[PDB]
Design a binder for this molecule. Sequence first.
Ligand SMILES: Nc1ncnc2c1ncn2[C@@H]1O[C@H](COP(=O)(O)OP(=O)(O)OC[C@H]2O[C@@H](n3cnc(C[C@H](N)C(=O)O)c3)[C@H](O)[C@@H]2O)[C@@H](O)[C@H]1O
Ligand SMILES: Nc1ncnc2c1ncn2[C@@H]1O[C@H](COP(=O)(O)OP(=O)(O)OC[C@H]2O[C@@H](n3cnc(C[C@H](N)C(=O)O)c3)[C@H](O)[C@@H]2O)[C@@H](O)[C@H]1O
Lengths: 207, 211
Amino acid sequence: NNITLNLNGSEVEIKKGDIFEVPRNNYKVIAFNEYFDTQVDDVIIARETLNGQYIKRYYSHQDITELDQKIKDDVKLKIEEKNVERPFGGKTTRYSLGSVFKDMDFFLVAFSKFDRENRAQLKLNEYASCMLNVWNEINTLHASKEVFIPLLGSGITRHVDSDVGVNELLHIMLWTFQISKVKFREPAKVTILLYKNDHKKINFYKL
Amino acid sequence: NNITLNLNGSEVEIKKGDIFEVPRNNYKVIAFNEYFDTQVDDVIIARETLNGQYIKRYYSHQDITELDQKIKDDVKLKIEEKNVERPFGGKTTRYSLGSVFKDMDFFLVAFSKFDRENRAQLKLNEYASCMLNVWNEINTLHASKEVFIPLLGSGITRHVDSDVGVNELLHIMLWTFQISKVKFREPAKVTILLYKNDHKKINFYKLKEFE
Ligand SMILES: Nc1ncnc2c1ncn2[C@@H]1O[C@H](COP(=O)(O)OP(=O)(O)OC[C@H]2O[C@@H](n3cnc(C[C@H](N)C(=O)O)c3)[C@H](O)[C@@H]2O)[C@@H](O)[C@H]1O
Ligand SMILES: Nc1ncnc2c1ncn2[C@@H]1O[C@H](COP(=O)(O)OP(=O)(O)OC[C@H]2O[C@@H](n3cnc(C[C@H](N)C(=O)O)c3)[C@H](O)[C@@H]2O)[C@@H](O)[C@H]1O
């Protein structure tokens, strides 16, 4: 099923699709972690995540070195902490949740937190506040292009202080989008893509 | 014009009322600043705010000393920074926005930020993130009692990066309430109070659309 929600003049469309099949004339969101980690060894970053699929599909190992340098050099990324201890490897600079690094037509999001076991996790309020910063970045950077975003949080992300369901993750995305709209009266045209069986789990009647 | 909203099995009532006329057996929310400042001299804290009215109504200058001590003794208040320079006076410990200090039947909220001019202000995302933490504390502390709350942000607070109106502040309060409900599936029974003729500036039709 495909739907288009008119949110007081701003249309958000929810439909089935593949984030990697969107034409190049559009922006695509991919959730990274609070370190923008790029090591896809199934230890730090897992190849099953979009974070992992994106790096393996578009980046050779020597290209990853340049990507790490461009992120490090992006002065707009707000730093929360430096010289953090990663016991199994990984980058040592932690960024604010919801920070967006622009990688050509892709918006790479500092989405989830990592502990010393490299377990991606968010408290519910951290998830809500992260999405707020994501819409803030998206509404700033869209430049009249359309933005495609997956159902952020509905993957391996551990929601450690709630029993939130995928339908509720979608509702939090729409609520924080409506909050962000108040600041950006002309927001981006956003499309939320559902993947495979996740399209059936969403109740479009309530949506 | 008084209405009750049913938000997925949770009732949030919006009515006209006076926060200082609520029965003692209920919890009442009052917005302080990020420092929990208590000096009402119209320089730091202005007597026109609920922050100032609450202090003048219930606290002598001698009692304020004990209140200042009880706040800094509260280990639950998360500290963002210590020893900030206040050029015109005030407290130097800064707390996370939305921190709630419980003062008997009152919830005192670290609501707004202060600059070196002592200007209460919030960016819109700071306001939304503040309300998120407020509902978190309220849903944690309510203990089956009813919680009464004013329309936070609709007073002297400066919204510095948007043209947010009164109705939109109320909509953000409800949206952040709905988010916090996902974590607290038995949320507090909440009543939002509108003062004097502020109910006349509220579009109650748009409020019912939250159902
Ligand atoms: N082609 C496609 N098009 C459109 N939608 C698609 C799609 N394919 C799949 N979807 C669906 O889209 C939803 C989102 O997908 P996804 O982004 O993967 O999930 P997420 O929860 O939003 O984010 C994951 C978080 O974990 C971190 N992380 C990275 N590696 C680790 C391992 C670590 N050691 C640990 O154990 O934690 C942790 C990573 O940095 C990130 O922050 C999902 O429903 C999926 O089915
Ligand atoms: N009896 C009643 N019952 C029910 N509702 C009532 C009521 N009375 C009034 N209402 C209505 O309730 C709404 C909220 O009232 P109120 O709390 O006053 O406004 P607020 O924006 O939510 O919070 C103010 C912020 O500024 C800070 N601040 C403190 N002093 C300064 C001066 C500083 N030098 C500067 O210049 O900034 C700044 C203070 O710490 C706080 O964070 C409003 O619509 C009002 O009409």
